[PDB]
Design a protein around this ligand. Sequence first.
Ligand SMILES: *[C@@H]1O[C@H](CO)[C@@H](O[C@@H]2O[C@H](CO)[C@@H](O[C@@H]3O[C@H](CO)[C@@H](O)[C@H](O)[C@@H]3O)[C@H](O)[C@H]2NC(C)=O)[C@H](O)[C@H]1NC(C)=O
Ligand code: CHT
Length: 493
Amino acid sequence: FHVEGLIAIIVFYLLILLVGIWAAWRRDIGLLVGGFTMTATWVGGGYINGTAEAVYVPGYGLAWAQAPIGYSLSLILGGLFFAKPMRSKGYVTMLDPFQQIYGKRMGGLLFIPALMGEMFWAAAIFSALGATISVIIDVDMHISVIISALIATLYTLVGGLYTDVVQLFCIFVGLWISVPFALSHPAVADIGFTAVHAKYQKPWLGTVDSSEVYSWLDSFLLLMLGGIPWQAYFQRVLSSSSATYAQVLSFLAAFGCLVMAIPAILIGAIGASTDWNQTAYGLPDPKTTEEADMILPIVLQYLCPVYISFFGLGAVSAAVMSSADSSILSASSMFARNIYQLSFRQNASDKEIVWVMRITVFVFGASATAMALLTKTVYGLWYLSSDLVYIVIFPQLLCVLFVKGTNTYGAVAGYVSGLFLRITGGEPYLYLQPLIFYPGYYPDDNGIYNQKFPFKTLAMVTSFLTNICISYLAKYLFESGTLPPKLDVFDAV
Ligand SMILES: *[C@@H]1O[C@H](CO)[C@@H](O[C@@H]2O[C@H](CO)[C@@H](O[C@@H]3O[C@H](CO)[C@@H](O)[C@H](O)[C@@H]3O)[C@H](O)[C@H]2NC(C)=O)[C@H](O)[C@H]1NC(C)=O
Ligand SMILES: C[N+](C)(C)CCO
């Protein structure tokens, strides 16, 4: 087990690194490579393992696999709406507009939650990589994720002293070659039948009841409008040369990620349609055994022959471990540059960049490892990433950019209001019992209250209206008498 798995992973990762450095070593297609790399930024660890877990779990089903359909629509909306009002004014990055208007220091306050979201995303990628490595070499869960994160961070440290194209071909081959003949054991039932009638378990095409349609709408408008303000997307859009180039790139990336989500949904459907008693996985199912994150690696390993399995599985592991470096490097470099050019100053010649980036990558590897080492989900961390980005970035990025009005006062007021209406609202994925108990609450199996009434969307709306109202009242009273203009720290007058 151990030796063959290590051989496969080492061989395939060495090959992909050689191919990448060779392509870097030395027309009518240019958009397609850009589309592939931009959809390579989203895919990797997030979709495949995450959406496999979302489909497989009895209770979620496909109807609650909110992410893969959420983020393609996120790209479409972001391109079609924000692609135009991002060129004429002139924006180096998405961090620049916040520092341009809200004095400059408030950018760090606004990008501590985006940093937290990217921490969550890195934790999801690390958990996916740990799951795949643990399945392929059969050593353990907690050790595997720590080792994988250590390798990823060490590779980040010296990896800077085109790859993304080969990375997606690795995923596309690895999955689509392993499930034209995977649903062929005497165990796997008809993928069409277990969608609507339930052989081994409750149907993988999950059902949403009329009582909790509001939760669906909220948790789907969350993903749609929280996948847009991410740093990687706006870093790729602004470097695009032509105006319509950004729109075309976003549309092709959305189509690519929709096509890429197909091989992973069927994997979850197979996993939910098997008979985990005639295979080699023993009597317990991966549902009454908290290993629902490994559904995709388990179906790839056990429901495929020896030679077909490890090719695709090693390809998937290599692709996700490749994406880990991009995640960590962005999450460290953006923080270092923005906030240590924000706070006072630091000598950027030979000290600031080197040691602050080094300490940042070390601490972020440690934090992502600790964050993904305890939460036994791979979809939950990803969802919470998009969640917090939605709550406390999208309203302010929408009011600063789309039309007009946002002062600094409204920024802090909306920040406080949104954070309050969430942290008092309740986070079921973590062990955070709510404190307001919005009408329609139903207790969960664990013992953690979750709410049917929407409070993420309510938090977004409250933050936006708080920003607008506070800023316009500031424009009302910028004169004397009512709060004389002497008080001025961050100015709107
Ligand atoms: C998969 O599950 C099936 C049952 O759904 C298992 O098949 C049955 O397993 C039992 C226990 O090993 C075999 O012994 C039988 O036990 C009952 C208990 O009262 C006894 O009354 C019978 O006289 C018999 O001794 C049983 O023969 C077997 N049935 C068949 C048709 O093979 C099976 O072991 C599970 N695992 C697989 C298929 O890998
Ligand atoms: C929505 N995110 C950008 C956080 C991940 C896409 O997989």
